[PDB]
Design a protein around this ligand. Structure first.
Ligand SMILES: Cc1nc(Nc2n[nH]c3c2CN(C(=O)N[C@H](CN(C)C)c2ccccc2)C3(C)C)c2sccc2n1
Length: 293
């Protein structure tokens, strides 16, 4: 019975020796959620990022299976590409594309962004969001840490461990999942929510690009969880620094009324995304974040 859920996971993964298909292994990161290596596809000569997790020691097969499956059926230019999976010696190896420009968290916490650079990032993310939302997938963990950057300034979404599928029959969801500071109020208050929670988290992510961090970050997770549920729409520290069209975009991402809050399809047409700079204008941000590290 359990955990015979592994049979699905062992049926998912590709077979064969990952050692044979990839060489030039170099460690690039090592968090609590695994360790990332760079490597070269012996075939195409292409560079890949391989995440290695301890298995059991995390876990949870139900949701890590969900992560693989969801990525496979949801390929998009604005989503970090999933390549392969291999289970070797109680380790789950997930081969992903390599983005060398680091994360949006490096940028937002070490640099200042102009409205043109923020609009370019918001656009790419909404493009990924509209695609997932049309395929009835809710990310539920949108934050700057899950935005990866290409050396050319490419903006791509990652981390599908927390996503959830939806149907016309079950159009909502009720689990208190995600990361506290980015969580929509309707999620914090255990109400039935929809895809628009990702829109809220995008808005908080925009606040990151503005102020360097999401609201209440000095407070502890539970304290922040309380602050969100009571205050509703978060206040900017210096709202007047923003153009009126940026403030409008923000207010529509952070609208308490789910019905009034924008959808990804809607927000892609907003006048704030007009003044978007090309993605090349992100490379000095990237360069700046690298320095001071
Ligand atoms: C680690 C690292 N990755 C880089 N680029 C990447 N290319 N491809 C990928 C990454 C990072 N990735 C990733 O899954 N990171 C997650 C954390 N994220 C999701 C919140 C992670 C990091 C460390 C340990 C476990 C899990 C993938 C998509 C494989 C880069 S660029 C400069 C430094 C750097 N350091």
């Amino acid at each position: 019975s359990d955990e015979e859920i592994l049979e699905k996971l062992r049926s998912i993964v590709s077979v064969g020796d990952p050692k044979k298909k990839y060489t030039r292994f170099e460690k690039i990161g090592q968090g609590a959620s695994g360790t990332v290596y760079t490597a070269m596809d012996v075939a195409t000569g292409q560079e890949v990022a391989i995440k290695q997790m301890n298995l059991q020691q995390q876990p949870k097969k139900e949701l890590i299976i969900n992560e693989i499956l969801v990525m496979r059926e949801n390929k998009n230019p604005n989503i970090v590409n999933y390549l392969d999976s291999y289970l070797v010696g109680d380790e789950l190896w997930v081969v992903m594309e390599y983005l060398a420009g680091g994360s949006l968290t490096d940028v937002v916490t070490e640099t200042c962004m102009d409205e043109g650079q923020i609009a370019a990032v918001c656009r790419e993310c909404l493009q990924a969001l509209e695609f997932l939302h049309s395929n009835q997938v809710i990310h539920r963990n949108i934050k700057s840490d899950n935005i990866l950057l290409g050396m050319d300034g490419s903006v791509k979404l990652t981390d599908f461990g927390f996503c959830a599928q939806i149907t016309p029959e079950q159009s909502k969801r009720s689990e208190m999942v995600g990361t506290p500071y980015w969580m929509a109020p309707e999620v914090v208050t255990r109400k039935a929510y929809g895809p628009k929670v990702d829109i809220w988290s995008l808005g908080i992510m925009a606040i990151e690009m503005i102020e360097g961090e999401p609201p209440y970050l000095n407070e502890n997770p539970l304290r922040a969880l309380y602050l969100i549920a009571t205050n509703g729409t978060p206040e900017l520290q210096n709202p007047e620094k923003l153009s009126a069209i940026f403030r409008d975009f923000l207010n529509r991402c952070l609208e308490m009324d789910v019905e009034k809050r924008g959808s990804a399809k809607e927000l892609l047409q907003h006048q704030f995304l007009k003044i978007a700079k090309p993605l090349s204008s992100l490379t000095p941000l990237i360069a700046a974040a690298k320095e001071a590290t």
